[PDB]
């Protein structure tokens, strides 16, 4: 598992170099933008339950074949496993948001997940839909301009979207 700083450090060690002024500037800028990051994490984490619930409801409304007898999300056990999966994906996403790097999401969540869903028979494309829903919702919540010190968070939201899209592409 790596964070942004650890990533730069590892890349520099592979070459056996001290950090250059450019890298010091970049990391310093990352630090200066830490409050926005902590805000995003705090918000998405604070609304995780409603994100997963609303995303699931919307999914099953759009694809009722998943929740009818014979579907993959039929019975309470498989429904619970689906809601659980969504919680996991959102969780490791938030991990990546705090870390500034997708290393933890990849290794501990996305690596080998396409194979799992193929073996079980779960349609990874539906999971991708779910991840898209949770993405839009989470970005809305994190970029809600009410009750916070105004400013520009456009670069952070594109990164969060980067992690979500990364997951969706990983499962689909």
């Amino acid at each position: 598992m790596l964070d942004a700083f650890a990533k730069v450090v590892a890349q520099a060690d592979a070459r056996g170099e001290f950090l250059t002024n450019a890298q010091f500037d970049a990391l310093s800028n990352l630090v200066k933008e830490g409050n926005k990051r902590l805000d995003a994490v705090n918000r998405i984490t604070s609304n995780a339950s409603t994100i997963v619930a609303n995303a699931a409801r919307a999914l099953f409304a759009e694809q009722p074949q998943l929740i009818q007898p014979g579907g993959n999300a039929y019975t309470n056990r498989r429904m619970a496993a689906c809601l659980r999966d969504m919680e996991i994906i959102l969780r490791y996403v938030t991990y990546a948001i705090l870390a500034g790097d997708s290393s933890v999401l990849d290794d501990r969540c996305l690596n080998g997940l396409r194979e799992t869903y193929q073996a079980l028979g779960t349609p990874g494309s539906s999971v991708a839909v779910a991840i898209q829903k949770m993405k839009d919702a989470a970005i809305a919540i994190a970029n809600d301009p009410n009750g916070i010190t105004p400013g520009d968070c456009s670069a952070l939201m594109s990164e969060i979207a980067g992690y979500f899209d990364r997951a969706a592409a990983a499962v689909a």
Partner: protein
């Protein structure tokens, strides 16, 4: 790699939990201390050479037998001195890495792991590198909380060698 952020994430994942306010106040100590940390890293990087030389000489004066004794482990040959300056540079660079990452992760994973086995196999005395690190700690020119960071990680190295 051990960092405040990775320690927080690992803490929340070890128990299948989302992040909480706890982990965020941790990452907050990180971001806040990152100013002094970054200052010390910049300063050490800027004066790395003058100081690897100050330090290599500290070692050679403290342990003169290492510049006269016959052996591939000693700095009695140009290749030996080259290896020594190399290793001192490794220690300093590791310190800068720790200062950049906000934790001991880099030094733990790139250096400390396997240090005893190496020093034993190649007949390298820890006291040499302890002396070099003491010199660097004494002459890095830092004041205030930057010196606290630099000294924190240097002393971490010394304790690893003790």
């Amino acid at each position: 790699m051990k960092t405040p952020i990775t320690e927080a994430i690992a803490a929340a994942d070890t128990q299948g939990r989302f992040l909480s306010n706890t982990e965020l106040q941790a990452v907050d100590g990180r971001f806040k201390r990152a100013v002094a940390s970054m200052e010390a890293a910049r300063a050490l990087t800027n004066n790395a050479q003058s100081l690897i030389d100050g330090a290599a000489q500290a070692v050679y004066q403290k342990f003169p037998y290492t510049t006269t004794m016959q052996g591939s482990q000693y700095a009695s040959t140009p290749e030996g001195k080259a290896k020594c300056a190399r290793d001192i540079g490794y220690y300093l660079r590791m310190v800068t890495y720790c200062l950049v990452a906000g934790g001991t992760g880099p030094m733990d994973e790139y250096l400390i792991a396997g240090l005893s086995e190496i020093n034993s196999t190649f007949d390298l005395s820890p006291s040499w590198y302890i002396e070099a690190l003491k010199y660097i700690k004494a002459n890095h020119g830092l004041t205030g909380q930057a010196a606290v960071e630099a000294n924190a990680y240097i002393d971490y190295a010394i304790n690893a060698l003790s």
